[PDB]
Amino acid sequence: TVDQVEELRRDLRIKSQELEVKNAAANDKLEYAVLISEAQAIKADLAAVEAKVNRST
């Protein structure tokens, strides 16, 4: 379980970095609605991931 939670933390930080990269890409592209939708989906996934990480902690 502890190793799995470490995996969850790695996925959390990787997806946070990906969200930041896509947000910067959307800001540069301000081909914008697709990037906005992708960033919103990644942010929702990150919120769910953070909630289940909080449950694990």
Side-chain angles (χ1 to χ4, degrees):
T1 308
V2 164
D3 164 69
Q4 271 288 322
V5 169
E6 178 62 35
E7 271 164 17
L8 309 194
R9 282 169 168 278
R10 293 198 294 106
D11 181 66
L12 171 66
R13 58 187 61 107
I14 283 161
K15 265 147 163 169
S16 311
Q17 294 161 0
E18 285 163 353
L19 175 84
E20 293 305 309
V21 163
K22 297 304 290 293
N23 198 6
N27 271 313
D28 277 350
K29 279 275 201 162
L30 195 141
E31 281 285 326
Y32 190 33
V34 182
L35 286 189
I36 285 173
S37 299
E38 185 85 26
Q40 288 306 310
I42 293 173
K43 215 183 211 165
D45 289 312
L46 274 169
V49 159
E50 198 70 78
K52 59 93 174 178
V53 162
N54 273 19
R55 288 163 89 182
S56 70
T57 51

mmCIF file of all heavy atoms in Angstrom:
data_model
loop_
_atom_site.group_PDB
_atom_site.id
_atom_site.type_symbol
_atom_site.label_atom_id
_atom_site.label_comp_id
_atom_site.label_asym_id
_atom_site.label_seq_id
_atom_site.Cartn_x
_atom_site.Cartn_y
_atom_site.Cartn_z
ATOM 1 N N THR A 1 0.822 -1.207 0.000
ATOM 2 C CA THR A 1 0.000 0.000 0.000
ATOM 3 C C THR A 1 0.858 1.260 0.000
ATOM 4 O O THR A 1 0.548 2.228 -0.701
ATOM 5 C CB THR A 1 -0.939 -0.005 1.207
ATOM 6 O OG1 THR A 1 -1.663 -1.242 1.245
ATOM 7 C CG2 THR A 1 -1.928 1.152 1.127
ATOM 8 N N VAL A 2 1.940 1.266 0.782
ATOM 9 C CA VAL A 2 2.830 2.425 0.827
ATOM 10 C C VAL A 2 3.515 2.632 -0.522
ATOM 11 O O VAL A 2 3.627 3.765 -1.011
ATOM 12 C CB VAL A 2 3.847 2.263 1.974
ATOM 13 C CG1 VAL A 2 5.012 3.230 1.816
ATOM 14 C CG2 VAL A 2 3.160 2.477 3.313
ATOM 15 N N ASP A 3 3.975 1.544 -1.148
ATOM 16 C CA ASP A 3 4.565 1.648 -2.481
ATOM 17 C C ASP A 3 3.544 2.139 -3.501
ATOM 18 O O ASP A 3 3.868 2.948 -4.381
ATOM 19 C CB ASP A 3 5.144 0.296 -2.901
ATOM 20 C CG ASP A 3 5.420 0.216 -4.390
ATOM 21 O OD1 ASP A 3 6.349 0.906 -4.862
ATOM 22 O OD2 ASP A 3 4.714 -0.543 -5.087
ATOM 23 N N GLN A 4 2.299 1.671 -3.389
ATOM 24 C CA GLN A 4 1.242 2.141 -4.278
ATOM 25 C C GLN A 4 0.978 3.629 -4.088
ATOM 26 O O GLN A 4 0.779 4.355 -5.065
ATOM 27 C CB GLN A 4 -0.032 1.329 -4.047
ATOM 28 C CG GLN A 4 -0.133 0.080 -4.908
ATOM 29 C CD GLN A 4 -0.418 0.402 -6.360
ATOM 30 O OE1 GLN A 4 -1.179 1.321 -6.664
ATOM 31 N NE2 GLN A 4 0.192 -0.353 -7.266
ATOM 32 N N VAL A 5 0.980 4.101 -2.839
ATOM 33 C CA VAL A 5 0.764 5.521 -2.567
ATOM 34 C C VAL A 5 1.920 6.354 -3.113
ATOM 35 O O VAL A 5 1.719 7.467 -3.616
ATOM 36 C CB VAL A 5 0.548 5.742 -1.056
ATOM 37 C CG1 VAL A 5 0.596 7.222 -0.695
ATOM 38 C CG2 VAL A 5 -0.781 5.148 -0.625
ATOM 39 N N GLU A 6 3.145 5.827 -3.036
ATOM 40 C CA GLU A 6 4.275 6.502 -3.674
ATOM 41 C C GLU A 6 4.083 6.585 -5.185
ATOM 42 O O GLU A 6 4.397 7.611 -5.809
ATOM 43 C CB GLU A 6 5.580 5.783 -3.334
ATOM 44 C CG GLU A 6 6.811 6.387 -3.992
ATOM 45 C CD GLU A 6 7.062 7.818 -3.556
ATOM 46 O OE1 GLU A 6 6.800 8.139 -2.378
ATOM 47 O OE2 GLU A 6 7.517 8.627 -4.393
ATOM 48 N N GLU A 7 3.553 5.516 -5.789
ATOM 49 C CA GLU A 7 3.215 5.552 -7.212
ATOM 50 C C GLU A 7 2.156 6.609 -7.505
ATOM 51 O O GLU A 7 2.229 7.310 -8.524
ATOM 52 C CB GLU A 7 2.731 4.175 -7.676
ATOM 53 C CG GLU A 7 3.831 3.252 -8.173
ATOM 54 C CD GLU A 7 3.384 1.801 -8.258
ATOM 55 O OE1 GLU A 7 2.160 1.551 -8.252
ATOM 56 O OE2 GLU A 7 4.260 0.914 -8.343
ATOM 57 N N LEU A 8 1.158 6.726 -6.622
ATOM 58 C CA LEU A 8 0.120 7.742 -6.784
ATOM 59 C C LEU A 8 0.708 9.144 -6.713
ATOM 60 O O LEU A 8 0.308 10.027 -7.477
ATOM 61 C CB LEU A 8 -0.972 7.580 -5.723
ATOM 62 C CG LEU A 8 -1.666 6.237 -5.467
ATOM 63 C CD1 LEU A 8 -2.930 6.433 -4.633
ATOM 64 C CD2 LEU A 8 -1.957 5.448 -6.751
ATOM 65 N N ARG A 9 1.655 9.365 -5.799
ATOM 66 C CA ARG A 9 2.312 10.667 -5.697
ATOM 67 C C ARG A 9 3.127 10.980 -6.948
ATOM 68 O O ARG A 9 3.146 12.129 -7.417
ATOM 69 C CB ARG A 9 3.203 10.713 -4.454
ATOM 70 C CG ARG A 9 2.445 10.918 -3.152
ATOM 71 C CD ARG A 9 3.341 10.677 -1.942
ATOM 72 N NE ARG A 9 2.719 11.130 -0.702
ATOM 73 C CZ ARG A 9 2.717 12.386 -0.276
ATOM 74 N NH1 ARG A 9 3.300 13.353 -0.965
ATOM 75 N NH2 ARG A 9 2.114 12.680 0.874
ATOM 76 N N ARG A 10 3.813 9.972 -7.495
ATOM 77 C CA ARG A 10 4.550 10.170 -8.742
ATOM 78 C C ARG A 10 3.609 10.527 -9.889
ATOM 79 O O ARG A 10 3.898 11.434 -10.681
ATOM 80 C CB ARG A 10 5.354 8.917 -9.085
ATOM 81 C CG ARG A 10 6.494 8.620 -8.126
ATOM 82 C CD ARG A 10 7.494 7.654 -8.741
ATOM 83 N NE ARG A 10 6.922 6.330 -8.966
ATOM 84 C CZ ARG A 10 6.579 5.857 -10.157
ATOM 85 N NH1 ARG A 10 6.714 6.584 -11.254
ATOM 86 N NH2 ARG A 10 6.089 4.625 -10.248
ATOM 87 N N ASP A 11 2.475 9.828 -9.985
ATOM 88 C CA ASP A 11 1.491 10.152 -11.014
ATOM 89 C C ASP A 11 0.927 11.554 -10.813
ATOM 90 O O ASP A 11 0.710 12.288 -11.784
ATOM 91 C CB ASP A 11 0.365 9.117 -11.012
ATOM 92 C CG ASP A 11 -0.677 9.388 -12.082
ATOM 93 O OD1 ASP A 11 -0.338 9.294 -13.280
ATOM 94 O OD2 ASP A 11 -1.833 9.695 -11.726
ATOM 95 N N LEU A 12 0.703 11.941 -9.555
ATOM 96 C CA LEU A 12 0.192 13.271 -9.241
ATOM 97 C C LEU A 12 1.149 14.358 -9.710
ATOM 98 O O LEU A 12 0.738 15.316 -10.372
ATOM 99 C CB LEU A 12 -0.051 13.385 -7.735
ATOM 100 C CG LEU A 12 -0.389 14.766 -7.168
ATOM 101 C CD1 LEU A 12 -1.728 15.261 -7.688
ATOM 102 C CD2 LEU A 12 -0.372 14.740 -5.648
ATOM 103 N N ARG A 13 2.438 14.217 -9.388
ATOM 104 C CA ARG A 13 3.388 15.259 -9.774
ATOM 105 C C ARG A 13 3.620 15.272 -11.284
ATOM 106 O O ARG A 13 3.764 16.349 -11.882
ATOM 107 C CB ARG A 13 4.705 15.101 -9.010
ATOM 108 C CG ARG A 13 5.409 13.772 -9.170
ATOM 109 C CD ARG A 13 6.605 13.672 -8.240
ATOM 110 N NE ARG A 13 6.212 13.770 -6.840
ATOM 111 C CZ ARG A 13 6.205 12.751 -5.991
ATOM 112 N NH1 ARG A 13 6.583 11.539 -6.363
ATOM 113 N NH2 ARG A 13 5.812 12.953 -4.737
ATOM 114 N N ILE A 14 3.626 14.097 -11.924
ATOM 115 C CA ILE A 14 3.802 14.042 -13.376
ATOM 116 C C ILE A 14 2.627 14.714 -14.080
ATOM 117 O O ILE A 14 2.809 15.515 -15.008
ATOM 118 C CB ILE A 14 3.988 12.585 -13.837
ATOM 119 C CG1 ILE A 14 5.408 12.108 -13.522
ATOM 120 C CG2 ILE A 14 3.699 12.438 -15.324
ATOM 121 C CD1 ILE A 14 5.560 10.602 -13.510
ATOM 122 N N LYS A 15 1.403 14.422 -13.631
ATOM 123 C CA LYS A 15 0.234 15.035 -14.250
ATOM 124 C C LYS A 15 0.134 16.521 -13.926
ATOM 125 O O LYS A 15 -0.384 17.289 -14.740
ATOM 126 C CB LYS A 15 -1.034 14.299 -13.821
ATOM 127 C CG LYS A 15 -1.473 13.224 -14.801
ATOM 128 C CD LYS A 15 -2.130 12.056 -14.089
ATOM 129 C CE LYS A 15 -2.916 11.192 -15.062
ATOM 130 N NZ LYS A 15 -3.354 9.915 -14.436
ATOM 131 N N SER A 16 0.632 16.950 -12.761
ATOM 132 C CA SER A 16 0.686 18.381 -12.471
ATOM 133 C C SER A 16 1.645 19.100 -13.414
ATOM 134 O O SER A 16 1.333 20.189 -13.917
ATOM 135 C CB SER A 16 1.093 18.606 -11.015
ATOM 136 O OG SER A 16 0.311 17.814 -10.139
ATOM 137 N N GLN A 17 2.815 18.504 -13.668
ATOM 138 C CA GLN A 17 3.750 19.087 -14.627
ATOM 139 C C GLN A 17 3.147 19.128 -16.027
ATOM 140 O O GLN A 17 3.315 20.114 -16.757
ATOM 141 C CB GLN A 17 5.061 18.302 -14.631
ATOM 142 C CG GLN A 17 5.846 18.396 -13.332
ATOM 143 C CD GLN A 17 6.858 17.278 -13.184
ATOM 144 O OE1 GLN A 17 6.986 16.421 -14.058
ATOM 145 N NE2 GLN A 17 7.581 17.278 -12.069
ATOM 146 N N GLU A 18 2.435 18.065 -16.415
ATOM 147 C CA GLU A 18 1.779 18.046 -17.721
ATOM 148 C C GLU A 18 0.690 19.109 -17.815
ATOM 149 O O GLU A 18 0.526 19.748 -18.861
ATOM 150 C CB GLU A 18 1.203 16.656 -17.996
ATOM 151 C CG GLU A 18 2.254 15.621 -18.370
ATOM 152 C CD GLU A 18 1.750 14.199 -18.229
ATOM 153 O OE1 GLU A 18 0.630 14.013 -17.709
ATOM 154 O OE2 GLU A 18 2.476 13.268 -18.635
ATOM 155 N N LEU A 19 -0.064 19.313 -16.730
ATOM 156 C CA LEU A 19 -1.078 20.362 -16.708
ATOM 157 C C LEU A 19 -0.450 21.740 -16.854
ATOM 158 O O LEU A 19 -0.975 22.593 -17.578
ATOM 159 C CB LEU A 19 -1.888 20.291 -15.414
ATOM 160 C CG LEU A 19 -2.905 21.419 -15.217
ATOM 161 C CD1 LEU A 19 -4.209 21.100 -15.929
ATOM 162 C CD2 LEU A 19 -3.146 21.711 -13.743
ATOM 163 N N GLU A 20 0.674 21.976 -16.172
ATOM 164 C CA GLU A 20 1.364 23.257 -16.312
ATOM 165 C C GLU A 20 1.868 23.463 -17.737
ATOM 166 O O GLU A 20 1.761 24.567 -18.290
ATOM 167 C CB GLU A 20 2.519 23.343 -15.313
ATOM 168 C CG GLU A 20 2.076 23.402 -13.859
ATOM 169 C CD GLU A 20 1.104 24.534 -13.590
ATOM 170 O OE1 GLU A 20 1.408 25.684 -13.972
ATOM 171 O OE2 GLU A 20 0.035 24.274 -13.000
ATOM 172 N N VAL A 21 2.406 22.404 -18.351
ATOM 173 C CA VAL A 21 2.904 22.499 -19.724
ATOM 174 C C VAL A 21 1.764 22.822 -20.686
ATOM 175 O O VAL A 21 1.887 23.698 -21.553
ATOM 176 C CB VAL A 21 3.633 21.201 -20.118
ATOM 177 C CG1 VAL A 21 3.800 21.106 -21.629
ATOM 178 C CG2 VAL A 21 4.985 21.121 -19.428
ATOM 179 N N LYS A 22 0.627 22.136 -20.533
ATOM 180 C CA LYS A 22 -0.500 22.384 -21.428
ATOM 181 C C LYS A 22 -1.140 23.745 -21.176
ATOM 182 O O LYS A 22 -1.644 24.369 -22.115
ATOM 183 C CB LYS A 22 -1.539 21.270 -21.298
ATOM 184 C CG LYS A 22 -1.022 19.898 -21.704
ATOM 185 C CD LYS A 22 -0.470 19.907 -23.124
ATOM 186 C CE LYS A 22 -1.575 20.058 -24.156
ATOM 187 N NZ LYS A 22 -2.463 18.866 -24.200
ATOM 188 N N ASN A 23 -1.125 24.227 -19.929
ATOM 189 C CA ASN A 23 -1.611 25.574 -19.649
ATOM 190 C C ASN A 23 -0.728 26.626 -20.309
ATOM 191 O O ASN A 23 -1.230 27.608 -20.870
ATOM 192 C CB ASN A 23 -1.684 25.805 -18.141
ATOM 193 C CG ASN A 23 -2.566 26.983 -17.772
ATOM 194 O OD1 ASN A 23 -3.220 27.576 -18.629
ATOM 195 N ND2 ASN A 23 -2.586 27.328 -16.489
ATOM 196 N N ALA A 24 0.595 26.434 -20.253
ATOM 197 C CA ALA A 24 1.502 27.344 -20.947
ATOM 198 C C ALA A 24 1.287 27.289 -22.455
ATOM 199 O O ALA A 24 1.327 28.324 -23.135
ATOM 200 C CB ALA A 24 2.951 27.009 -20.597
ATOM 201 N N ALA A 25 1.053 26.089 -22.994
ATOM 202 C CA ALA A 25 0.784 25.948 -24.423
ATOM 203 C C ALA A 25 -0.504 26.661 -24.822
ATOM 204 O O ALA A 25 -0.558 27.317 -25.866
ATOM 205 C CB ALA A 25 0.718 24.469 -24.801
ATOM 206 N N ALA A 26 -1.551 26.544 -24.000
ATOM 207 C CA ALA A 26 -2.805 27.237 -24.281
ATOM 208 C C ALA A 26 -2.638 28.751 -24.199
ATOM 209 O O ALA A 26 -3.194 29.488 -25.024
ATOM 210 C CB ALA A 26 -3.894 26.763 -23.319
ATOM 211 N N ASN A 27 -1.876 29.230 -23.210
ATOM 212 C CA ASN A 27 -1.629 30.664 -23.093
ATOM 213 C C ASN A 27 -0.851 31.190 -24.293
ATOM 214 O O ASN A 27 -1.111 32.299 -24.773
ATOM 215 C CB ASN A 27 -0.884 30.965 -21.793
ATOM 216 C CG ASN A 27 -1.823 31.203 -20.625
ATOM 217 O OD1 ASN A 27 -2.790 31.958 -20.736
ATOM 218 N ND2 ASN A 27 -1.542 30.558 -19.499
ATOM 219 N N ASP A 28 0.113 30.408 -24.788
ATOM 220 C CA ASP A 28 0.827 30.797 -26.000
ATOM 221 C C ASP A 28 -0.073 30.743 -27.229
ATOM 222 O O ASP A 28 0.069 31.571 -28.136
ATOM 223 C CB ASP A 28 2.050 29.903 -26.198
ATOM 224 C CG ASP A 28 3.244 30.361 -25.385
ATOM 225 O OD1 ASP A 28 3.185 31.470 -24.815
ATOM 226 O OD2 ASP A 28 4.241 29.612 -25.315
ATOM 227 N N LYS A 29 -0.998 29.783 -27.279
ATOM 228 C CA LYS A 29 -1.910 29.644 -28.406
ATOM 229 C C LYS A 29 -3.072 30.627 -28.359
ATOM 230 O O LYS A 29 -3.843 30.687 -29.323
ATOM 231 C CB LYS A 29 -2.456 28.215 -28.467
ATOM 232 C CG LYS A 29 -1.519 27.218 -29.129
ATOM 233 C CD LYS A 29 -1.680 27.225 -30.640
ATOM 234 C CE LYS A 29 -1.168 25.933 -31.253
ATOM 235 N NZ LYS A 29 -1.694 25.721 -32.628
ATOM 236 N N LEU A 30 -3.229 31.369 -27.265
ATOM 237 C CA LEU A 30 -4.246 32.417 -27.188
ATOM 238 C C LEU A 30 -4.005 33.489 -28.248
ATOM 239 O O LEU A 30 -4.943 33.977 -28.876
ATOM 240 C CB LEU A 30 -4.264 33.052 -25.792
ATOM 241 C CG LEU A 30 -5.478 33.910 -25.413
ATOM 242 C CD1 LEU A 30 -5.859 33.677 -23.962
ATOM 243 C CD2 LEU A 30 -5.218 35.392 -25.654
ATOM 244 N N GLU A 31 -7.355 26.981 -32.350
ATOM 245 C CA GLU A 31 -6.457 26.044 -31.685
ATOM 246 C C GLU A 31 -6.313 26.379 -30.204
ATOM 247 O O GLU A 31 -5.242 26.209 -29.621
ATOM 248 C CB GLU A 31 -5.086 26.046 -32.361
ATOM 249 C CG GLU A 31 -5.025 25.236 -33.645
ATOM 250 C CD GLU A 31 -5.013 23.742 -33.390
ATOM 251 O OE1 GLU A 31 -4.431 23.316 -32.371
ATOM 252 O OE2 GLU A 31 -5.586 22.992 -34.210
ATOM 253 N N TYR A 32 -7.397 26.854 -29.602
ATOM 254 C CA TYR A 32 -7.415 27.229 -28.194
ATOM 255 C C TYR A 32 -8.486 26.502 -27.396
ATOM 256 O O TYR A 32 -8.248 26.148 -26.238
ATOM 257 C CB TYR A 32 -7.609 28.749 -28.060
ATOM 258 C CG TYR A 32 -7.413 29.289 -26.659
ATOM 259 C CD1 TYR A 32 -6.490 28.715 -25.793
ATOM 260 C CD2 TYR A 32 -8.146 30.379 -26.208
ATOM 261 C CE1 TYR A 32 -6.310 29.206 -24.513
ATOM 262 C CE2 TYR A 32 -7.969 30.880 -24.930
ATOM 263 C CZ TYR A 32 -7.049 30.288 -24.088
ATOM 264 O OH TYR A 32 -6.868 30.777 -22.815
ATOM 265 N N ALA A 33 -9.662 26.267 -27.987
ATOM 266 C CA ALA A 33 -10.734 25.577 -27.274
ATOM 267 C C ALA A 33 -10.356 24.134 -26.959
ATOM 268 O O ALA A 33 -10.690 23.619 -25.883
ATOM 269 C CB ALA A 33 -12.024 25.629 -28.090
ATOM 270 N N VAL A 34 -9.662 23.466 -27.886
ATOM 271 C CA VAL A 34 -9.219 22.093 -27.654
ATOM 272 C C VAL A 34 -8.234 22.038 -26.494
ATOM 273 O O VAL A 34 -8.317 21.156 -25.629
ATOM 274 C CB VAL A 34 -8.612 21.507 -28.942
ATOM 275 C CG1 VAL A 34 -8.202 20.057 -28.730
ATOM 276 C CG2 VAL A 34 -9.598 21.627 -30.095
ATOM 277 N N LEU A 35 -7.291 22.983 -26.453
ATOM 278 C CA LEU A 35 -6.325 23.021 -25.360
ATOM 279 C C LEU A 35 -6.996 23.363 -24.035
ATOM 280 O O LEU A 35 -6.611 22.833 -22.987
ATOM 281 C CB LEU A 35 -5.211 24.018 -25.681
ATOM 282 C CG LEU A 35 -4.202 23.561 -26.739
ATOM 283 C CD1 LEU A 35 -3.024 24.517 -26.821
ATOM 284 C CD2 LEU A 35 -3.725 22.142 -26.460
ATOM 285 N N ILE A 36 -8.008 24.237 -24.063
ATOM 286 C CA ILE A 36 -8.758 24.559 -22.848
ATOM 287 C C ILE A 36 -9.479 23.323 -22.324
ATOM 288 O O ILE A 36 -9.455 23.029 -21.122
ATOM 289 C CB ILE A 36 -9.740 25.716 -23.112
ATOM 290 C CG1 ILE A 36 -8.996 27.048 -23.202
ATOM 291 C CG2 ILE A 36 -10.806 25.790 -22.027
ATOM 292 C CD1 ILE A 36 -9.883 28.197 -23.617
ATOM 293 N N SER A 37 -10.128 22.577 -23.223
ATOM 294 C CA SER A 37 -10.835 21.365 -22.815
ATOM 295 C C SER A 37 -9.871 20.318 -22.273
ATOM 296 O O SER A 37 -10.166 19.647 -21.273
ATOM 297 C CB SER A 37 -11.631 20.803 -23.994
ATOM 298 O OG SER A 37 -12.599 21.734 -24.445
ATOM 299 N N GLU A 38 -8.709 20.166 -22.915
ATOM 300 C CA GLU A 38 -7.712 19.213 -22.436
ATOM 301 C C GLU A 38 -7.180 19.612 -21.064
ATOM 302 O O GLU A 38 -7.007 18.758 -20.186
ATOM 303 C CB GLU A 38 -6.570 19.100 -23.445
ATOM 304 C CG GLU A 38 -5.535 18.047 -23.090
ATOM 305 C CD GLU A 38 -5.929 16.664 -23.570
ATOM 306 O OE1 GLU A 38 -6.690 16.570 -24.554
ATOM 307 O OE2 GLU A 38 -5.477 15.671 -22.961
ATOM 308 N N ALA A 39 -6.926 20.908 -20.859
ATOM 309 C CA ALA A 39 -6.457 21.380 -19.560
ATOM 310 C C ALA A 39 -7.513 21.173 -18.482
ATOM 311 O O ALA A 39 -7.185 20.801 -17.350
ATOM 312 C CB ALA A 39 -6.058 22.853 -19.648
ATOM 313 N N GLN A 40 -8.786 21.403 -18.815
ATOM 314 C CA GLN A 40 -9.859 21.172 -17.850
ATOM 315 C C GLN A 40 -9.975 19.695 -17.490
ATOM 316 O O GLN A 40 -10.177 19.350 -16.319
ATOM 317 C CB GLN A 40 -11.184 21.697 -18.402
ATOM 318 C CG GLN A 40 -11.291 23.214 -18.427
ATOM 319 C CD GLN A 40 -11.023 23.842 -17.073
ATOM 320 O OE1 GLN A 40 -11.590 23.431 -16.061
ATOM 321 N NE2 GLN A 40 -10.151 24.844 -17.048
ATOM 322 N N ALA A 41 -9.850 18.808 -18.484
ATOM 323 C CA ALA A 41 -9.897 17.374 -18.210
ATOM 324 C C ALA A 41 -8.725 16.936 -17.336
ATOM 325 O O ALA A 41 -8.901 16.151 -16.395
ATOM 326 C CB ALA A 41 -9.911 16.590 -19.521
ATOM 327 N N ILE A 42 -7.524 17.443 -17.629
ATOM 328 C CA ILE A 42 -6.354 17.100 -16.826
ATOM 329 C C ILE A 42 -6.497 17.648 -15.409
ATOM 330 O O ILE A 42 -6.100 16.998 -14.437
ATOM 331 C CB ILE A 42 -5.070 17.600 -17.518
ATOM 332 C CG1 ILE A 42 -4.836 16.831 -18.819
ATOM 333 C CG2 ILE A 42 -3.857 17.433 -16.618
ATOM 334 C CD1 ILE A 42 -3.696 17.373 -19.653
ATOM 335 N N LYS A 43 -7.095 18.835 -15.264
ATOM 336 C CA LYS A 43 -7.304 19.405 -13.938
ATOM 337 C C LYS A 43 -8.324 18.602 -13.137
ATOM 338 O O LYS A 43 -8.160 18.418 -11.926
ATOM 339 C CB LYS A 43 -7.745 20.864 -14.057
ATOM 340 C CG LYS A 43 -7.211 21.762 -12.952
ATOM 341 C CD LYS A 43 -7.736 23.181 -13.093
ATOM 342 C CE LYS A 43 -6.739 24.195 -12.559
ATOM 343 N NZ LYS A 43 -7.061 25.578 -13.004
ATOM 344 N N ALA A 44 -9.386 18.122 -13.790
ATOM 345 C CA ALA A 44 -10.348 17.263 -13.103
ATOM 346 C C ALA A 44 -9.711 15.942 -12.682
ATOM 347 O O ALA A 44 -9.957 15.449 -11.571
ATOM 348 C CB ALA A 44 -11.563 17.013 -13.996
ATOM 349 N N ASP A 45 -8.886 15.361 -13.559
ATOM 350 C CA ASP A 45 -8.162 14.144 -13.203
ATOM 351 C C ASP A 45 -7.223 14.389 -12.030
ATOM 352 O O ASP A 45 -7.114 13.552 -11.128
ATOM 353 C CB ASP A 45 -7.382 13.623 -14.411
ATOM 354 C CG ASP A 45 -8.283 13.039 -15.478
ATOM 355 O OD1 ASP A 45 -9.168 12.229 -15.131
ATOM 356 O OD2 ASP A 45 -8.102 13.384 -16.664
ATOM 357 N N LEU A 46 -6.547 15.539 -12.022
ATOM 358 C CA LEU A 46 -5.660 15.891 -10.919
ATOM 359 C C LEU A 46 -6.430 16.095 -9.622
ATOM 360 O O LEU A 46 -5.942 15.738 -8.548
ATOM 361 C CB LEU A 46 -4.867 17.146 -11.270
ATOM 362 C CG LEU A 46 -3.577 16.914 -12.051
ATOM 363 C CD1 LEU A 46 -3.039 18.228 -12.565
ATOM 364 C CD2 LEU A 46 -2.557 16.237 -11.160
ATOM 365 N N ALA A 47 -7.624 16.687 -9.699
ATOM 366 C CA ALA A 47 -8.442 16.865 -8.502
ATOM 367 C C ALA A 47 -8.876 15.521 -7.926
ATOM 368 O O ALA A 47 -8.811 15.307 -6.707
ATOM 369 C CB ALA A 47 -9.657 17.735 -8.822
ATOM 370 N N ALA A 48 -9.306 14.598 -8.791
ATOM 371 C CA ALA A 48 -9.662 13.258 -8.325
ATOM 372 C C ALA A 48 -8.450 12.530 -7.746
ATOM 373 O O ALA A 48 -8.554 11.842 -6.717
ATOM 374 C CB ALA A 48 -10.280 12.453 -9.468
ATOM 375 N N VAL A 49 -7.290 12.681 -8.391
ATOM 376 C CA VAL A 49 -6.065 12.051 -7.911
ATOM 377 C C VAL A 49 -5.669 12.611 -6.552
ATOM 378 O O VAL A 49 -5.288 11.862 -5.647
ATOM 379 C CB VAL A 49 -4.945 12.210 -8.958
ATOM 380 C CG1 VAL A 49 -3.569 12.053 -8.326
ATOM 381 C CG2 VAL A 49 -5.125 11.193 -10.075
ATOM 382 N N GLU A 50 -5.768 13.930 -6.377
ATOM 383 C CA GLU A 50 -5.446 14.541 -5.093
ATOM 384 C C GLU A 50 -6.418 14.096 -4.008
ATOM 385 O O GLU A 50 -6.017 13.897 -2.857
ATOM 386 C CB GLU A 50 -5.440 16.064 -5.224
ATOM 387 C CG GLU A 50 -4.712 16.781 -4.097
ATOM 388 C CD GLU A 50 -3.211 16.570 -4.149
ATOM 389 O OE1 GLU A 50 -2.543 17.227 -4.975
ATOM 390 O OE2 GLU A 50 -2.700 15.747 -3.361
ATOM 391 N N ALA A 51 -7.698 13.931 -4.356
ATOM 392 C CA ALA A 51 -8.676 13.474 -3.371
ATOM 393 C C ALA A 51 -8.373 12.056 -2.897
ATOM 394 O O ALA A 51 -8.416 11.770 -1.694
ATOM 395 C CB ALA A 51 -10.085 13.555 -3.953
ATOM 396 N N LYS A 52 -8.048 11.155 -3.832
ATOM 397 C CA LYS A 52 -7.739 9.784 -3.427
ATOM 398 C C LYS A 52 -6.369 9.675 -2.758
ATOM 399 O O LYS A 52 -6.179 8.817 -1.888
ATOM 400 C CB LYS A 52 -7.889 8.835 -4.624
ATOM 401 C CG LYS A 52 -7.026 9.114 -5.843
ATOM 402 C CD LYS A 52 -5.712 8.383 -5.895
ATOM 403 C CE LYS A 52 -5.058 8.669 -7.242
ATOM 404 N NZ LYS A 52 -3.726 8.061 -7.476
ATOM 405 N N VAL A 53 -5.427 10.560 -3.094
ATOM 406 C CA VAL A 53 -4.170 10.627 -2.349
ATOM 407 C C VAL A 53 -4.419 11.097 -0.919
ATOM 408 O O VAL A 53 -3.823 10.575 0.034
ATOM 409 C CB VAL A 53 -3.157 11.527 -3.084
ATOM 410 C CG1 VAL A 53 -2.030 11.971 -2.156
ATOM 411 C CG2 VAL A 53 -2.570 10.792 -4.281
ATOM 412 N N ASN A 54 -5.304 12.082 -0.742
ATOM 413 C CA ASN A 54 -5.665 12.535 0.598
ATOM 414 C C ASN A 54 -6.343 11.426 1.392
ATOM 415 O O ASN A 54 -6.086 11.262 2.593
ATOM 416 C CB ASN A 54 -6.569 13.765 0.510
ATOM 417 C CG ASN A 54 -5.785 15.058 0.420
ATOM 418 O OD1 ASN A 54 -4.600 15.058 0.084
ATOM 419 N ND2 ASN A 54 -6.441 16.171 0.727
ATOM 420 N N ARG A 55 -7.211 10.650 0.735
ATOM 421 C CA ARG A 55 -7.826 9.501 1.395
ATOM 422 C C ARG A 55 -6.777 8.474 1.810
ATOM 423 O O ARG A 55 -6.845 7.917 2.914
ATOM 424 C CB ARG A 55 -8.864 8.859 0.476
ATOM 425 C CG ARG A 55 -10.128 9.677 0.302
ATOM 426 C CD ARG A 55 -10.920 9.209 -0.904
ATOM 427 N NE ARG A 55 -11.864 8.150 -0.569
ATOM 428 C CZ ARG A 55 -12.645 7.539 -1.449
ATOM 429 N NH1 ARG A 55 -12.608 7.848 -2.736
ATOM 430 N NH2 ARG A 55 -13.483 6.597 -1.029
ATOM 431 N N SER A 56 -5.794 8.221 0.941
ATOM 432 C CA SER A 56 -4.732 7.274 1.273
ATOM 433 C C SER A 56 -3.884 7.769 2.442
ATOM 434 O O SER A 56 -3.487 6.978 3.307
ATOM 435 C CB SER A 56 -3.860 7.018 0.045
ATOM 436 O OG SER A 56 -3.093 8.162 -0.288
ATOM 437 N N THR A 57 -3.594 9.071 2.485
ATOM 438 C CA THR A 57 -2.814 9.612 3.596
ATOM 439 C C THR A 57 -3.602 9.565 4.898
ATOM 440 O O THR A 57 -3.028 9.323 5.966
ATOM 441 C CB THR A 57 -2.366 11.042 3.296
ATOM 442 O OG1 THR A 57 -3.492 11.825 2.888
ATOM 443 C CG2 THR A 57 -1.316 11.053 2.198
#
